[PDB]
Design a binder for this molecule. Sequence first.
Ligand SMILES: C/C(=C\CCP(=O)(O)OP(=O)(O)O)CO
Length: 186
Amino acid sequence: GAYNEWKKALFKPADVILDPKTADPILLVSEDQRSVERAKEPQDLPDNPERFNWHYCVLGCESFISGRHYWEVEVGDRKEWHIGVCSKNVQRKGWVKMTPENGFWTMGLTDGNKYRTLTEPRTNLKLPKPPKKVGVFLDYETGDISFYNAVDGSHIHTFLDVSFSEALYPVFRILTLEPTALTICP
Ligand SMILES: C/C(=C\CCP(=O)(O)OP(=O)(O)O)CO
């Protein structure tokens, strides 16, 4: 459809790989650096400054300061996940709420069927079908972050007219221990 035919004409396809140095020690980054899973217990890793030590988050290796970009994430049959972008300057040590005011622009799924935007307050999304693959789209200049069902091209959510100042990283978060991973499409 139009989604497939037009996406690269309008947005530059980002080749996003996960940065193991940023991943919470309870997270496992795959060898090919496209997939993330959760461990039963935290691994023994350094608390280097780049690492999220409280939030179960991991970042992409590269950030954006301009232009239009997109990447796709296979969420599959996961019951829980949150993806989007965050500012380079987010608090990585300890806890703050993942909201736009704290530099996080994400949406996702909890409890198998509760789709929401991580905002203050959180807003519930009504999706006609559960997405298996999600397209994340960034237009830095217009300040739009948009999410689409990457299979049927249907709209999921758009953060509108954000005045971005900082560089933006792709961000990924998983809380649950389940057999299906969260995977970036190349
Ligand atoms: C406290 C907990 C789940 C709630 C996570 P949270 O309070 O940051 O809520 P969220 O950021 O998913 O809207 C147990 O992992």
